[PDB]
Write an enzyme that holds these catalytic residues in place. Sequence first.
Site, PDB file in Angstrom:
ATOM      1  N   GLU A  83     -11.012   7.068 -13.400  1.00  0.00           N
ATOM      2  CA  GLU A  83     -11.968   7.041 -14.500  1.00  0.00           C
ATOM      3  C   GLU A  83     -13.325   7.593 -14.105  1.00  0.00           C
ATOM      4  O   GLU A  83     -14.176   7.865 -14.962  1.00  0.00           O
ATOM      5  CB  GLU A  83     -12.121   5.565 -14.957  1.00  0.00           C
ATOM      6  CG  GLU A  83     -10.830   4.941 -15.566  1.00  0.00           C
ATOM      7  CD  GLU A  83     -10.667   3.394 -15.489  1.00  0.00           C
ATOM      8  OE1 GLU A  83      -9.806   2.863 -16.234  1.00  0.00           O
ATOM      9  OE2 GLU A  83     -11.337   2.688 -14.742  1.00  0.00           O
ATOM     10  N   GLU A 114       3.966  -2.074   2.430  1.00  0.00           N
ATOM     11  CA  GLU A 114       2.762  -2.863   2.744  1.00  0.00           C
ATOM     12  C   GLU A 114       2.794  -3.488   4.131  1.00  0.00           C
ATOM     13  O   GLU A 114       1.778  -3.923   4.641  1.00  0.00           O
ATOM     14  CB  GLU A 114       2.548  -3.976   1.695  1.00  0.00           C
ATOM     15  CG  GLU A 114       3.406  -5.196   1.846  1.00  0.00           C
ATOM     16  CD  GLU A 114       3.105  -6.279   0.782  1.00  0.00           C
ATOM     17  OE1 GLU A 114       2.937  -5.932  -0.398  1.00  0.00           O
ATOM     18  OE2 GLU A 114       3.051  -7.478   1.129  1.00  0.00           O
TER      19      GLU A 114
END
Lengths: 295, 295
Positions: A83, A114
């Site tokens: 954004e 992870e």
Amino acid sequence: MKLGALISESRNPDTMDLDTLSTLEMLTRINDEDRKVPEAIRLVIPNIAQAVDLAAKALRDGGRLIYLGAGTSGRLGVLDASECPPTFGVPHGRVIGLIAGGPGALLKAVEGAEDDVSLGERDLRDLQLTATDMVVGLAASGRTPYVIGALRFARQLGCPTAAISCNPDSPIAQEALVAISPVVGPEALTGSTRMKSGTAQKLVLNMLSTGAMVKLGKVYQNLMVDVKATNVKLVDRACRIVVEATGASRVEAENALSQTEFEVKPAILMILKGVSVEQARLNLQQHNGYLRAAL
Amino acid sequence: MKLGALISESRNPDTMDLDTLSTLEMLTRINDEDRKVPEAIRLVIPNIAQAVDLAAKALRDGGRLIYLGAGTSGRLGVLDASECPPTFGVPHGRVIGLIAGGPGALLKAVEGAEDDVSLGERDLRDLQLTATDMVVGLAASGRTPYVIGALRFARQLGCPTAAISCNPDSPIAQEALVAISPVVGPEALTGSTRMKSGTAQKLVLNMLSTGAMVKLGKVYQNLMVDVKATNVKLVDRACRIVVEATGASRVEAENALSQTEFEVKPAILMILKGVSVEQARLNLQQHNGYLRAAL
């Protein structure tokens, strides 16, 4: 602490019978938990402020703001970073979100990634991390190996670092310079940290990017003057911003914006000072892009 | 209404001087706005409940739950959908998030894509949409053409539909069967709907997927019994769930989970009823996967 002792992994005493509730009831229980998140963030505003000031310093000094996480935490970093170009006009390489497992993880979870401490380091080395860049590691649990390794690498290079976690005194908080630790409590579904913890992470990332970009001169009043307008809604907003900020007709506004390639800041200057596009751009460069200082 | 008249595009009277505030002050203004979001969602719980019940019906009847949006709205749909396989054990094709511009839009904004009404229809046709599938269109503004076109296509096929927007009486709310319209007010940065509106969207999506999956038997008490455990944390959680639910040792727990390929539901049955993996799986099939009914 061991995983099973973490607050994020604890059972919520108010949702022990979640699966026996009516739909309405169940949703009210979830919303009761959501109500807790803004107050958890309020308590850590001082830490978030420290991080905003470091991020602004990093971007002013020519560096980048880099978010890094696995799974949900990683996708939220990419969400905030994505954004920044349309909202603040910066190049996409200025604010970057990294996720364990690479781009495929944006669309389909790959939870095994992870666990590798070396992968976080690898992903940062692949962006040619420098000491000026700021690295923000995100892990609800506060113990995700990908994030621990990434933060260790950034710290040793001399980078400013922040850690966002929802458990107190976490491993990632210990590694980082600034710890942002909003404690939201047990999730409505036990261990479902995509819920309150994810919401908290989103609120913190939006505060970091908005706070830093406002400090860097990418806003004027509460108007999005550095919008990068490449669609109908954004170009219409650009026109409305110019009218809101100059008190001039949308027509004078549209003609000026056309000349500035839809860049709002120089259009406002052109109108308020009666100068050319070229003069407006130079004036803004002289003031390091701060419209207030150019007015 | 025209774009400039929408609440989402209006100036927030409490942040008119956002760029002149100290970092602390600015962050407190943002947090004051975040405080408003859980109450805005509370007011629309009845509509969210209607949507949860339609989604559960759609998934029970063999269909999919499909989220669709441009930009931030689209990335939030993908965020929620991505979490369904690890959390609820469903295949990745069961809950799907679509974004205008395709996978590239997950990493880099392509704001121009949202203006094509035909693209939303195209993306749904490419998933072989059927009348049983449920389609949820997300647009803070309530007027994004990509979303309008998608919802029109789904409606004509006979699909249950929902629209999530933050402006009242929006075009997408008019097209959809169920309108979820949390009104969060003007954003701290004018038009920055990635902020409160995005938070609202996230809260609603998490309510939809969690609510529907709980109704479908993918939870037991407030425990994640359908976790798909493919990493250290998730497999450790699977073990702890079995111990929490049976009152048996983590050892009996670990041996049972090893036999069930780390599937929690059959492990719980094996332990509580003293049956084989094979018998446990058949018993769960007889009860349509609902552990409570099998106990």
